[PDB]
Amino acid sequence: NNKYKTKLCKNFARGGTGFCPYGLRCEFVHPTDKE
Numbered sequence: 001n002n003k004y005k006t007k008l009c010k011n012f013a014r015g016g017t018g019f020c021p022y023g024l025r026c027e028f029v030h031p032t033d034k035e
């Protein structure tokens with residue numbers, strides 16, 4: 001289900017930028033990040 005590391009970025013939150021400045025190195029987990 002969840003290992004608790006599913007922190008959808010404020011960047012990728014609807015109404016935000018949609019781009020994390022950190023990219024892949026972003027600590028916040030993207031909804032794009034699949035297994």
Ligand SMILES: [Zn+2]
Binds near residue numbers: 009027028030
């Ligand atoms: Zn991110």
